[PDB]
């Protein structure tokens, strides 16, 4: 959680890191997405891509991103420390993030938090000794009508109870991957008592088009 860096033996500028050639081609596409003279605008994706190659960002991907984009490393340090997704400390294989803002707290998300804490035997911000799960607390993740909700890696698991999140953890520990969706009856965001709107079939092309167009 510290915003300063100390050279540990496992995290130092001499730690080996380098992009794979397919990641290099992805980097060239990303820097081609931007106008010339503004290559630093590709600092945000490319550095994230480095995390997508490693799972965490030591200070060797920071310097490599600064080197391949011709920017000072202090700007890359600012970008990595400002945003919350960039892991400057090695997290476990499955990064569980539980939303505990007010709309999710109103639908009993703390029960999910203590259920995960009891099942995994760890606390918030701790990692399992097998380096499999990392449990932290996040803000609103944009699925407030499906509260309570967690996010594991890139996937969203919504409308959960303690039994559902225990089943999610059991499926993750067995080596499988669950379905990233709400655990209740509804599919994405419809009311649980059936479709209160959009029951009629869509009209199609040319419906209601004004004259003179």
């Amino acid at each position: 959680a510290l915003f300063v860096h100390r050279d540990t033996p496992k995290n130092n500028p001499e730690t080996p890191f380098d992009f794979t050639p397919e990641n290099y081609k992805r980097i060239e596409a990303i820097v081609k997405n931007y106008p010339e003279g503004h290559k630093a605008a590709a600092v945000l994706p490319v550095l994230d891509l480095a995390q997508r190659q490693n799972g965490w960002l030591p200070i060797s991907a920071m310097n490599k991103v600064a080197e391949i984009l011709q920017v000072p490393p202090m700007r890359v340090y600012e970008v990595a420390t400002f945003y919350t997704m960039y892991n400057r400390k090695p997290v476990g294989k499955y990064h569980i993030q539980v939303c505990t803002t007010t709309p999710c707290m109103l639908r009993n998300s703390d029960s999910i938090l203590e259920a995960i804490q009891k099942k995994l035997g760890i606390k918030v911000g701790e990692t399992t000794p097998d380096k499999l799960f990392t449990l932290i607390e996040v803000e609103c993740l944009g699925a407030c009508v499906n509260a309570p909700m967690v996010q594991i890696n890139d996937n969203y698991y919504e409308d959960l109870t303690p039994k559902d999140i225990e089943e999610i953890i059991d499926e993750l520990k067995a080596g499988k991957i669950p379905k990233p969706g709400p655990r209740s009856g509804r599919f994405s965001c419809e009311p649980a008592g059936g479709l209160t709107s959009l029951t009629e079939p869509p009209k199609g092309p040319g419906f209601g088009v004004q004259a003179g167009l």
Binding site: G37, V71, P72, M74, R75, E78
Partner: protein, 63 residues
């Protein structure tokens, strides 16, 4: 080890509104004097948008 002196006019500082009053007071009392002109800052040109230029070198690397 204190600071001893033999100059009586060491702590004398006189305040004048303009330069000509100080010159007249120095010439009246018979003191040989030197005068240096007032240095005012030149008016700068400040623009907040220059930090976000499109092709100029005045872009800020960070904010």
């Amino acid at each position: 080890g204190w600071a001893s002196t033999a100059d009586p006019l060491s702590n004398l500082v006189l305040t004048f509104s303009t330069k000509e009053d100080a010159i007249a007071f120095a010439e009246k009392n018979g003191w040989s004097y030197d005068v240096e002109e007032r240095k005012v800052p030149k008016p700068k040109s400040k623009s907040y948008g220059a930090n976000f230029s499109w092709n100029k070198r005045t872009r800020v690397s960070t904010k």
